[PDB]
C-alpha cells in the first residue's frame, strides 16, 4: 500500500531527486 | 446534639443524593432536571436554619467527623468549618443555583443531554460547597480542583466545537498557574506550622511571612481571574448561558477572593501582601471595565463586568476589609 | 585450597569420615529439585523426539526422574561433607592461632560515640 519508496528520505542534493521528492509529497517541483 | 451541626451537614448530603440516583431510573427519564432542582430548593430551605441560629446568637462550629489518616504528627480529617462565611454563603449560593436550574429547565429544554447537564450543575455545586465549608487546606484543595474540572467540563459542554474545547483548556491552564501558588501555600504551612487546618494555622502565624501569603494571592488571582491570569473568564462564555450565570459570574469565580477572606487573620498582619492584592485588584477592575465599554457581545460585556467586580473584591480585601468583600460576594 | 589436604585419598567421592554427618532427608528440597530436573529432561526428550510430551513413555520419564534423584542424593552428601570439612578446618585454625583471632572488647552504644549525620 505504502512502499519504502513513498517514505520521507534524506535531503535532496541534485535536482532530479528534488523533483522526485516533490512528486512523493504530491507537490509541484517549483513549489517543493 | 445541637441541630446546627446536623442541619449544616444534611444540607451538604442532600446535594449528593441525585448524583447517586443518576444511574437508577429517574436519570433516564425527563423528570431528572426537575428532581435535581427540587433537591436544590429543599437544600436551600434547610440551610436557612443554621443561618437563623447564627443570626440569633452567632452559632459557629467546626465539625471533624471522619478521621482519614495521620502522618506521624499531622492528622488529616474531614473537617467542616460552619462559620459566618459558610452559613451565609451556602444559602445564597443554593438560592442562586435554584434559580439557575429552574432557568435551565427552559433554556436547555431542547438539549438531548439535559439530564447530564443538570447532573454536572449539581456536581459543581457539591464541589463548591466542599470548597466553602472546608476547615483544612487539603479539603479546600479538593473543592478547588473539583470546581476547576467541573468548569472545564461545562465550558466545553459542546465538545464538537473547537473554540469551546480551547476555552475549557485555557481555563484549566490559568487555574493551574494559580494552583502552583495554592500548593506553595500548602507546602509552606505544612513545613512551618505543621498543619493544614485553619485553627492551628491561625494559631502559629501571628506574624505570617510573605511566601505563604504570596502563594495564596497567586491562587486567588488564578481563580478570580485577576490581571495577568484574567483572560480565561471572558472566554469561559463558551459554556451555555446557565453555566456562565452559575459558575463564571456569581458562585465559582469568587473562590479566589473567598480563599483570601478565609485567611484574613494572616493577611491582616502583612502590609506588603495587602498592598499587592490591593494593586492587583485595582488594575484588574480598571482594565476589565475598560474592555467592556467597547464589547459587542452581551455575554462578553457581562463577563468583563464580573471580572471588574472580582477586582473590586480584591481591592476591598487589600484594604483590610474582608467582611466587606464577603458581603459584596453575596450581594 | 582443598586439593593437598592431609588424609585426602584420591578418586574417593565420599570419604569414610562423611558417615558421621546426617544424611540428607528424602524429601530434601534440593533432592526434589533434582527430581524435577529429571522430569523436565523427560519432557524435553519427548519434545525433541516428537512424542506426546506428557503421556509418552512413562517408564522413560520415570527413569529420568529416579536417576536424577539417585545422583542428587550422593551429590548432596558430598556437598554437605565438603562444607562440614570447611567449617571443621576453620574452627581448628581459629583455635590453633588465638593471636590471629583476638577476643574483641565489646562496648555498648551508650559509651560508643557514633557520628550523627542530619537529613535536611
Amino acid at each position: 500500500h505504502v512502499t519504502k519508496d513513498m517514505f520521507p528520505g534524506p535531503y535532496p542534493k541534485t535536482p532530479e531527486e528534488r523533483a522526485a521528492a516533490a512528486k512523493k509529497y504530491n507537490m509541484r517541483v517549483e513549489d517543493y | 446534639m445541637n441541630p446546627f451541626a446536623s442541619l449544616t451537614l444534611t444540607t451538604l448530603i442532600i446535594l449528593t443524593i441525585p448524583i447517586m440516583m443518576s444511574n437508577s431510573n429517574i436519570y433516564k427519564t425527563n423528570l431528572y432536571p426537575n428532581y435535581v432542582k427540587t433537591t436544590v430548593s429543599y437544600a436551600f430551605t434547610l440551610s436557612l436554619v443554621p443561618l437563623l441560629m447564627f443570626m440569633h446568637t452567632g452559632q459557629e462550629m467546626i465539625i471533624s467527623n471522619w478521621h482519614w489518616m495521620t502522618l506521624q504528627t499531622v492528622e488529616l480529617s474531614l473537617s467542616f468549618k460552619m462559620d459566618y462565611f459558610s452559613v451565609m454563603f451556602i444559602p445564597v449560593a443554593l438560592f442562586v443555583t435554584w434559580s439557575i436550574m429552574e432557568f435551565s429547565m427552559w433554556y436547555m429544554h431542547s438539549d438531548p443531554f439535559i439530564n447530564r447537564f443538570f447532573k454536572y450543575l449539581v456536581l459543581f455545586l457539591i464541589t463548591m460547597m466542599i470548597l466553602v465549608t472546608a476547615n483544612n487546606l487539603f479539603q479546600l484543595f479538593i473543592g478547588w480542583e473539583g470546581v476547576g474540572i467541573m468548569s472545564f467540563l461545562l465550558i466545553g459542554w459542546w465538545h464538537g466545537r473547537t473554540d469551546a474545547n480551547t476555552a475549557a483548556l485555557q481555563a484549566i491552564l490559568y487555574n493551574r498557574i494559580g494552583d502552583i501558588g495554592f500548593v506553595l501555600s500548602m507546602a509552606w504551612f505544612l513545613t512551618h506550622s505543621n498543619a493544614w487546618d485553619l485553627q492551628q494555622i491561625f494559631m502559629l502565624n501571628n506574624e505570617c511571612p510573605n511566601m505563604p501569603l504570596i502563594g495564596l494571592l497567586l491562587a486567588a488571582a488564578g481563580k478570580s481571574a485577576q490581571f495577568g491570569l484574567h483572560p480565561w473568564l471572558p472566554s469561559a462564555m463558551e459554556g451555555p448561558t446557565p453555566v456562565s450565570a452559575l459558575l463564571h459570574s456569581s458562585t465559582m469565580v469568587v473562590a479566589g477572593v473567598f480563599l483570601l477572606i478565609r485567611f484574613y487573620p494572616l493577611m491582616e498582619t502583612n502590609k506588603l501582601v495587602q498592598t499587592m492584592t490591593l494593586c492587583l485588584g485595582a488594575i484588574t477592575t480598571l482594565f476589565t471595565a475598560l474592555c467592556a465599554i467597547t464589547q459587542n457581545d452581551i455575554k462578553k460585556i457581562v463577563a468583563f463586568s464580573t471580572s471588574s467586580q472580582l477586582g473590586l473584591m480584591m481591592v476591598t480585601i487589600g484594604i483590610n476589609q474582608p467582611h466587606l468583600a464577603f458581603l459584596h460576594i453575596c450581594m | 585450597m582443598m586439593s593437598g589436604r592431609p588424609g585426602r585419598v584420591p578418586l574417593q567421592f565420599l570419604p569414610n569420615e562423611a558417615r558421621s554427618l546426617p544424611p540428607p532427608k528424602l524429601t530434601d528440597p534440593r533432592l526434589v529439585y533434582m527430581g524435577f530436573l529429571g522430569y523436565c529432561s523427560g519432557l524435553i526428550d519427548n519434545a525433541i523426539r516428537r512424542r506426546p510430551v506428557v503421556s509418552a513413555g512413562l517408564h522413560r520419564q520415570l527413569l529420568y526422574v529416579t536417576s536424577f534423584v539417585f545422583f542428587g542424593y550422593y551429590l548432596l552428601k558430598r556437598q554437605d561433607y565438603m562444607y562440614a570439612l570447611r567449617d571443621h578446618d576453620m574452627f581448628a585454625y581459629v583455635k590453633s592461632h588465638p593471636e590471629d583471632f583476638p577476643e574483641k572488647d565489646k562496648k555498648t552504644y551508650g559509651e560508643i560515640l557514633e557520628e550523627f549525620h542530619p537529613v535536611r
Binding site: - | 484549566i172 494552583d179 507546602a187 | 549525620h117
Partner: protein, 459 residues
C-alpha cells in the same frame, strides 16, 4: 510467601493441561484467586516487618507492590486474549506461561530477604519481558526495542552485582535486616563514591532516570498490550523499591551524590512533560508521561525524608494503575483502527460514550486530581522537596501545569471534536474492554478511602 508463590506456580501446569478454549477462563479465574490471597499481606505491623522465613519477608513497602502485581496478571489476560485470538493453542499457552513466569519472578523479587537473591529475581524478569516484547510485538521496531531494554538494564545491573558481592565480602551479609541493623556511615572517598554509583545506577536506569530513558519509549510502545501494562506498572517500580532498600547503606554519601540525579530528574520531568505536548503517537505519549512521574519518585527517594518516601510509595502504586489504564485505553482504539497515530481517530466521544468516560477518568487520575492517591503522592513529594529547598516549587509547579496540559490535550484530541469521516469501523465497546477499564479504575478510587495501605512503612 509459599501460600502465594506455589498457587502462582500451579498456574503453569493448569494452563498447559487445560482445554484449548478454557485457557483464558482458567488463567483469569485462578489469577484473580491468587490476587485475593495476596491482600492478606496488607496486614502489617507498626514497627517490625512480616518476617516469614529466612528467605522471604514482607513490609508496608512491598505488600502494595505484590498486590499490584497479582492484580495486574488477570487484567493482562483480559487485554491479551483479543489480539491473540488467531494464535495457536501452544503459542497462547506460551504467552500465558511468560506472564505467569513474570508474575512469579516479581513476587519473589519484592519479598527476597537477601540482596543477591533480589538481584537474581529482578534480573530474571528481563527474560519473559524480552520474550514478550520481541516475539509478540507487532512492528519490526520491537527487535531494536528489545535490544535497547535488555542492554540498558544490563549495563546498569552488572556493576550492581559487583558492588553487592563486594559488600557481602566486607560486611559479611547481604541480608536486608542485618544490613539495616549493622549500618555503617559511608565515608567520602572515590572508592565509596563509585560503590554508591554501582549500588544506584541499576535502579536509576530501571526507573528510568532522565537521560537514561531512551529504551522506555521504544519498549513500552513496541510491546504488546500486556507487555506495556507490566513494563509501565510493575517493572519501573523495581528501581524505586530497590533504591529505597539500598539507600540505607549509602548515607551520608547520598547527601551530595544525589545532586546530579536530583538535577537530572527535576529538569527532565519538565523536559519529558514538554515532549508529551508534541507526541504524535498516543502510546508514545503515554510512555513518555511515565518518565515524569518516575522522576518525581527519583527526587523523593533521593531526598530521603519520611514524607518523601511516603509520597514515592503512593505515587508508584497510583502510576502503575493509571499508566496501565491509559495503555489499555489506547490499545482499544488501536485494535479498531490498527494505528497508534493520535489524530487518526478523533471525536470518539460521540461514538464510544462510556469509553470516553473511562478516558476522562484516566486523564483525571494522570492529572493528579485530589483526593486521588496520585495527588497524595505528588503532594507529599512536593512538600518534602519544598522543605529540601523552597526553589523546588517552581519546577514542580511547572511540571504539574504541563502535565495538566498534555493530559487534557490527549483527552481533547482523541475524544472531542468531529469524528473522522472515513473511519467506519468503530464498533461498540465490548463488555471485556469496559470491564478492563472498570477493574483498572475502581480499586484506584477505593484506595482513597484507606490511603495508608500504599503510604509505605514510614507511615
Amino acid at each position: 510467601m509459599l501460600k502465594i508463590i506455589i498457587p502462582t506456580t500451579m498456574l503453569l501446569p493448569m494452563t498447559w493441561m487445560s482445554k484449548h478454549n478454557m485457557i483464558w477462563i482458567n488463567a483469569t479465574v485462578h489469577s484473580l484467586l491468587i490476587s485475593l490471597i495476596s491482600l492478606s499481606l496488607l496486614n502489617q505491623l507498626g514497627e517490625n516487618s512480616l518476617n516469614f522465613s529466612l528467605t522471604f519477608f514482607s513490609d508496608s513497602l512491598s505488600a502494595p507492590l505484590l498486590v499490584l502485581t497479582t492484580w495486574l496478571l488477570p487484567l493482562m489476560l483480559m487485554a491479551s486474549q483479543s489480539h491473540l485470538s488467531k494464535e495457536t493453542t501452544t503459542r497462547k499457552k506460551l504467552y500465558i506461561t511468560m506472564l505467569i513466569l513474570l508474575q512469579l519472578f516479581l513476587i519473589m523479587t519484592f519479598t527476597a530477604t537477601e540482596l543477591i537473591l533480589f538481584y537474581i529475581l529482578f534480573e530474571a524478569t528481563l527474560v519473559p519481558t524480552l520474550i514478550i516484547i520481541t516475539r509478540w510485538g507487532n512492528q519490526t521496531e520491537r527487535l531494536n526495542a528489545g535490544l535497547y531494554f535488555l542492554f540498558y538494564t544490563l549495563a546498569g545491573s552488572l556493576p550492581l552485582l559487583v558492588a553487592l558481592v563486594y559488600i557481602q565480602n566486607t560486611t559479611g551479609s547481604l541480608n536486608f535486616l542485618i544490613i539495616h541493623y549493622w549500618s555503617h556511615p559511608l565515608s567520602n572517598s572515590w572508592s565509596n563514591i563509585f560503590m554508591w554509583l554501582a549500588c544506584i545506577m541499576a535502579f536509576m536506569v530501571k526507573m528510568p532516570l532522565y537521560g537514561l530513558h531512551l529504551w522506555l519509549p521504544k519498549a513500552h510502545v513496541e510491546a504488546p498490550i500486556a507487555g506495556s501494562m507490566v513494563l509501565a506498572a510493575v517493572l519501573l517500580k523495581l528501581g524505586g523499591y530497590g533504591m529505597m532498600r539500598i539507600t540505607t547503606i549509602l548515607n551520608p554519601l547520598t547527601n551530595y551524590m544525589a545532586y546530579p540525579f536530583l538535577m537530572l530528574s527535576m529538569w527532565g520531568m519538565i523536559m519529558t512533560s514538554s515532549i508529551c505536548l508534541r507526541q504524535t503517537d498516543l502510546k508514545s505519549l503515554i510512555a513518555y508521561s511515565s518518565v515524569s512521574h518516575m522522576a518525581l519518585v527519583i527526587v523523593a527517594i533521593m531526598i530521603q525524608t519520611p514524607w518523601s518516601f511516603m509520597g514515592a510509595t503512593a505515587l508508584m502504586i497510583a502510576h502503575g494503575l493509571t499508566s496501565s489504564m491509559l495503555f489499555c485505553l489506547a490499545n482499544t482504539n488501536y485494535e479498531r483502527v490498527h494505528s497508534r497515530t493520535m489524530i487518526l481517530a478523533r471525536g470518539l466521544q460521540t461514538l464510544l460514550p462510556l469509553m470516553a468516560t473511562w478516558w476522562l477518568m484516566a486523564s483525571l487520575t494522570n492529572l493528579a486530581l485530589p483526593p486521588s492517591i496520585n495527588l497524595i503522592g505528588e503532594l507529599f513529594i512536593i512538600t518534602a522537596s519544598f522543605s529540601w529547598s523552597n526553589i523546588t516549587i517552581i519546577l514542580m509547579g511547572m511540571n504539574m501545569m504541563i502535565t495538566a496540559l498534555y493530559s487534557l490535550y490527549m483527552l481533547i484530541t482523541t475524544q472531542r471534536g468531529k469524528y473522522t469521516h472515513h473511519i467506519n469501523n468503530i464498533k461498540a465497546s465490548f463488555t471485556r474492554e469496559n470491564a478492563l477499564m472498570a477493574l483498572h479504575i475502581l480499586p484506584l478510587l477505593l484506595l482513597t478511602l484507606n490511603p495508608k495501605m500504599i503510604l509505605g512503612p514510614l507511615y
